[PDB]
Sequence to fold (481 residues):
Amino acid sequence: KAGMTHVVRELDKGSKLHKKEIVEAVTVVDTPPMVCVGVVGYIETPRG
Amino acid sequence: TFKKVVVIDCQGHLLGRLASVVAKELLKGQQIICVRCEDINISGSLHRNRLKYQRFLRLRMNSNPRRGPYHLRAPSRILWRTIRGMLRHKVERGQKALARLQVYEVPTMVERKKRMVVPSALRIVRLKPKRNFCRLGDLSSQVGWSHGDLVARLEEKRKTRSSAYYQKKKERTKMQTEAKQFAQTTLPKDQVAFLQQYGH
Amino acid sequence: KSVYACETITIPAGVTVDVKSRVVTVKGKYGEITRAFRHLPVDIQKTKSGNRLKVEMWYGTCTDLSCIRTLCSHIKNMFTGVMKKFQYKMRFVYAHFPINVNISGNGTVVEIRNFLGEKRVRIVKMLPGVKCEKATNVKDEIALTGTDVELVSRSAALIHQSTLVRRKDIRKFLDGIYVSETSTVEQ
Amino acid sequence: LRKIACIGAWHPARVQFQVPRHGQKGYFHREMNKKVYRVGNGAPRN
RNA sequence: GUCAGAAUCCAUGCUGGAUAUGCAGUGUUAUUCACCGCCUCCUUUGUUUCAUGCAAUGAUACAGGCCUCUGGCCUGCUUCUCAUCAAAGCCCUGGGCGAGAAUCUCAAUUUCUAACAUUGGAGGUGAUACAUCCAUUGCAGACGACU
RNA sequence: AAAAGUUACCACAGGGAUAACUGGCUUGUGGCAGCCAAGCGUUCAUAGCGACGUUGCUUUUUGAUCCUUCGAUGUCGGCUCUUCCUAUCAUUGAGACGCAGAAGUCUCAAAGUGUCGGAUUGUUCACCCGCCAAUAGGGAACGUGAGCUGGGUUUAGACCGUCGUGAGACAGGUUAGUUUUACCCUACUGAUGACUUGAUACUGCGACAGUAAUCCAACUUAGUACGAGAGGAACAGUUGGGU
RNA sequence: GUAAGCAGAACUGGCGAUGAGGGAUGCUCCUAACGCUUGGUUAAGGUGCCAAAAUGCUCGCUCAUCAGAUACCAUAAAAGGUGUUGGUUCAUAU
Fold:
C-alpha cells in the first residue's frame, strides 16, 4: 500500500450523474512483479 | 478372556444399541476400533432425528459459548459421544475406557484386518419392517459435515481394490480344496471314515 | 392379522415383464419404464401361462393390505405407458392479456410470457422422459406426452404451479393454465 | 463517563460475552467488490 | 411412494483457532577429538491399564442372496486354519537328525512376549548450524510481544 | 396491682416466634385462550360475531399467606448496556371472507430484522403534537446505586390547612437537606508463556466457537388490470434513501 | 377460606432425638430400626449402559414434524379425531 489520491472519470450509468465528471478517491498500490519459486500438491483427505 | 483388537463394521447398526455393548466391553478392558461410522443407523425418520439434533444445537453456555456444549458434526465424533454418555467419564476409570476406543469414519491400516459385527444391535434384526429409519451419514451432512462425498469416493475406490484381492483368494481357495481331494484319497481308508464323523 | 390375500394382473399382448427381486422392468414397443418397489412387503411372481402376473402377501394387517392394490394400479399404468403413451392436454385461460408461450421442443422448456399483464418470464423445464407439443388448429393448448404417468403429471402440475395468481381473489381472476383431459395418444 | 454504566443483569451471575469491554483496537485481519481502474507500468506517462 | 416451497434452518463466505494441551509438507541441523545423527549386531537399566495362538482383509440383500454356477450352498467365528515326534536347550537351508530328561523327593507366576525410552560396546555409511539478549526500526507498542 | 399522653431529638436488650422489598405455595382479582349455540349479520347460528351457561392457562396486576432474611441482601423513577420470551404492531411466505380493484378484518408457519423525535408530570402509567413500514406486550432479585443521578419517598430546620387542652399527629400539601471502599477470588475484555517420538525456520490444514445485514421510496410497469363510476394494483427491470 | 408448602381440631403412627437400603436428588413416603464381625437368605426396589443383576422367555397394544416411561411427586381439563385396535346393538354383502 502506498497513498491515495483522487481521479476524474466520466460516469456511464439514467442516474442524474450520467455523462458527468465525478471526482473519486483512489488508492495507489505498489506491485513489483512476484517471482514464482515452488509448487505444492494437496491430497484431499476426510480430515481436510 | 478376549482378543487383542476387535474392529467393528458399523453399517446396519443401531446407534444406542451398538454403543451400550461397546461401552461395557471397554470397561472389561477390550481395545476396540469402530469403522464405517457414516453408515450407522437410527430409528425414526430423517426429519425426526434432525429436529432432535436441532434441539441439541439450541443448547449453549449463554455467558460464553466458547466454553459450553461442543456440537460435533461428524458421524465418528457423534458415535464417540453416545459411548461416552454410557460411562462414568469424570472418574479416572471411565477415562481409561475411552482411551481404548478408536473411532473412524475406512482408512488404510485396518482394511487389511477383519471387521466383526455385533448381531444384537442390528437393524434387520431389531427394527420391525416398514418402521422408518435414518442413516447417520445423511443426518450429519444435513448439519454441516462437509466430507460426505469423499467417504463415498474412497470407499468406492477401495471396494474395487478389495474385489481384486477377493478373486486371487477365491482362485486359491479352489486350489487348496482341489489338492485336499487328492490327499484325502491317498491316505488310508480307515482315517477317511474317521474324519467324516467329525466333519473335516 | 389376515392370513393370505392375492390379487392378479392381466398382462396385454405386446409387452414383456422381468421381475427380478422387487424391481420390475416393463419393456414394450414405444419405450421402457423401470420402477422399484422395495418399500412393500410382497411376493411378486408371474405365471406358467405368461400373460398373467400374480402378487400376494401373507400376514397383512389392514393398513398394509391396502398396498396390494396400489401395486396393481402402478404396474397397470406402466403397461398402458409403453403401449399407448400418456397425453395430458392443458388449456390456457385469460380475460384481457393473451398469454404468450414458446417451446424448445426437444429439450424441453416452456417460457411463459405476459401472464396477467406481467413482465417476469417463467421458464419451466420438464422432467427427463416427457416432451411438449404446442397443439395446432385448436386455439391455445399444450399437449404433454410421455411414457410414465408420474413424470408427465408432475410436469403438467409444475406449469399450473408456475402460473398462479397472488394478492387477489382467485374466484374472479380465473387466469391460468389447467389440465383438460387425461388420455392416451394411441388407441 | 467514557464507559458503559451497566455491564449486566444480576442473573446470569456472570458477565456475558456480548457486552462490550475495553481492549485492543486495530491490527485486525480483514473486503469485497472494489473496482480496479488502472494497471500501470514502471518501464513515463503513467 | 414422490414434487414445489419462506425475512426460516445448515452450509458457503467472514472473525478466531494457547478454542482440538489437534495434524501435514518443506528448509537448515553446532569448525573437523567434538559433540551429533541414521541403519544393523548385542548387552545395562526403567516405563506400560494391562503376552501366553491375547489369529482370521470381497461386497451386498433380508417378501432374498452367494458362487467352485446344467449343479451346489444358507438355518451363524457354534466355523476354518494353527497346535506332534524331547528340554523356552544344541547342531545341518526352513524343515530334519539323538538323548536315560528324574531326588524341582505330593502344588508355589510356566521369571525369557511386545514397542518405547535409556547406559556402554562392535561394524557399515553420514553432518560440519541456528535462536535469544544487545543496538536499530515504528507498518507496532501500558510492559512483554509484533515489523 | 392503686395508675394518662407524646417522641420525626431519641436510647438499650432482643426478635425473622412478627410488619414494610424480592423469592416460594395459591390465583379470588387482573390478564389471555377454548367448549355449547338464543339471537345479530337484508336472506343465512358459525365470513366476522356471540347472550344464558361452562372448561382451562398465566404469574407482566392486585390480594391472601408468613417459609427464608432484623450481629442490615442498599426501598421508586430515569439514564446507560446486554440478553431472553411470544400471547406478532411491522417486514417474509401462505390460507379464509359479506375479497371486483384499492383498503382491510380473521387464521397458520414465523422472534431472522425493526419498534422513533418532542410538550406537561419525580413519575410508573397517562394525554397530546409529529414522524414512520410499524411506533406490539413482557422477563432477567417488580434486570441494572463499590454504574451514575437524587427529582420522589423516608431523619434532624421551617411554613400552611385540618385534628389535639397540650407535648405533638396526618397513606394532606410545601421548600432546604452527606449517596463510602476493589489492590482479593471468579467472570468478562485484552496481553505474554513452559512443555508433548529432538532443535530451529518457513508454508499450511481447519475440528470447534462466533457471525450480518435489514427496511423504505421514486421512475417505468400504468392512469393498464379490475370497475356502472369514483378510484386504482403487482411481478421482472432502472435509480436512490434510512437504520 | 376461591385456594395455599394457609389457619384451627379428632384417632393412630412418624419426624424432632435416627442412622442403614430404596424413591436420581429430598428432616416426615417405602422396607427396616444400629454392639464389632465371617458365611448364608431376603425386604422395599430393580436387571441395555452409567450400575450389582435378563439386550431372558411369553402374549397383546402404540409411530408422536413436541411419543411415552413407575405411588407421595414435582400439574393438566372441558370438547373433538373416517389414526388404529377391539367390544355392544340394530338394518340390508354394504
